[PDB]
């Protein structure tokens, strides 16, 4: 292994197809941004001088000047712990061949990047855009959030630079972003949305409100969309173009605390959960995806996926890949 240092815990990355650069999102709770760390240090230095009244102020000024210049490396001494609900987050474009940072965007204090995508939009054809889903002021326990944003950058100079385009507000954390049929799907808390690019904001063109809890991930093949719920495992959604509708057509019959998902084939999903299990769920043959009187089955969808594989790995799995 070759190791390329990063500043915060990397949540996800994606590979830009035309240059092989990695767009990495890194995010820590209990953390200061560089800007905030600088500001905090400045006021600490000022307060350190203001603490002195006599000729001791000369020594206090020397100590403050020393303190402002001391720079103990975070990788050795630990990053300073900001309070509860404090976030630091960056978007990094690094070359994988040798880990030089091509570009580094630092997000505002208490913005936490949770999802990232790279895609083209059919309305503009050729340009590549990085969409980053951010929570604002997220409090982990108890859970509470001041909404979120999806930042859009165009990715330029043959995949090397993030030109900020616009920032689109959303009501809850955009936890998953998935390029889809020349637009993008976004999982905004429990809501699944189709967004087009626009100019000043991403434009909501379709939505489904029927996912149980928070969307933890999205995968797609063709007209099919596989949604990971944080707890209610896998929901199969079909997008219909002409009607402009997202229809739930199948779901799992077990709670799974999904952490990651890989599509094996057009009917089959491998899942991992928080409890160290892998499973494979398959739509049974002749499952139909072309779909107060309706109740569904067992308070879920009318058709059920069948668990064809279960295995306790023993360790929490955060990635799966057919390769």
């Amino acid at each position: 292994q070759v190791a390329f240092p990063l500043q915060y815990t990397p949540r996800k990355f994606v590979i830009h197809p035309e240059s092989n650069n990695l767009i990495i999102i890194e995010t820590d709770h209990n953390a200061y941004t560089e800007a905030t760390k600088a500001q905090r240090k400045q006021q600490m230095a000022e307060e350190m001088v203001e603490a002195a009244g006599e000729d001791e102020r000369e020594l206090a000024a020397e100590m403050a000047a020393a303190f402002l210049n001391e720079n103990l490396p975070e990788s050795i001494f630990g990053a300073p712990k900001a309070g509860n609900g404090q976030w630091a987050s960056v978007i990094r474009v690094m070359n994988p061949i040798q880990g030089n940072t091509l570009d580094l965007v630092q997000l505002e204090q208490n913005e936490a990047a949770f999802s990232v995508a790279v895609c083209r939009f059919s309305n503009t054809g050729e340009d590549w855009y990085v969409l980053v889903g951010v929570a604002k002021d997220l409090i982990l326990n108890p859970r509470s959030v001041a909404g979120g944003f999806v930042y859009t950058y165009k990715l330029v100079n043959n995949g090397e630079k993030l030109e900020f385009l616009h920032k689109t507000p959303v009501e809850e954390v955009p936890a998953a972003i998935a390029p889809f049929q020349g637009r993008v799907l976004i999982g905004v808390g429990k809501l699944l949305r189709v967004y087009d690019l626009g100019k000043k904001k991403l434009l909501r063109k379709c939505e489904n409100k029927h996912i149980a809890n928070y969307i933890s991930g999205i995968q797609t093949i063709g007209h099919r969309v596989i949604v990971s719920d944080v707890q209610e495992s896998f929901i199969w959604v079909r997008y219909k173009r002409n009607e402009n509708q997202l229809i739930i057509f199948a779901d799992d019959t077990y709670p799974r605390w999904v952490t990651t998902a890989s599509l094996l084939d057009y009917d089959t999903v491998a899942g991992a959960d928080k409890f160290g299990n892998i499973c494979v769920v398959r739509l049974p043959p002749n499952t139909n995806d072309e779909v107060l009187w309706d109740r569904g089955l067992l308070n879920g969808a009318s058709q059920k996926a069948e668990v064809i594989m279960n295995y306790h790995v023993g360790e929490t799995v955060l990635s799966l890949q057919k390769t």
Binding site: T9, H29, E315, T316
Partner: protein, 65 residues
């Protein structure tokens, strides 16, 4: 009946959930990876995550009704 965790016809909401929460925190303290998950998510030391879980064991759902 003798086994702590068992219920019966007169088990309240509060009693059952306090069982679920104390049982969850013990599972978290044992499953090293689930503890790993929480420590990374909170950006916190494992030792502090365990300590916080032990603190929460005392009254995990707020006071009895």
């Amino acid at each position: 009946s003798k086994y702590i965790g068992t219920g019966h016809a007169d088990t309240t909401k509060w009693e059952w959930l306090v069982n679920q929460h104390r049982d969850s925190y013990c599972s978290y303290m044992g499953h090293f990876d689930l503890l790993n998950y929480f420590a990374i998510a909170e950006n916190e030391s494992k030792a502090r995550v365990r300590f916080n879980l032990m603190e929460k064991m005392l009254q995990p759902c707020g006071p009895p009704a």
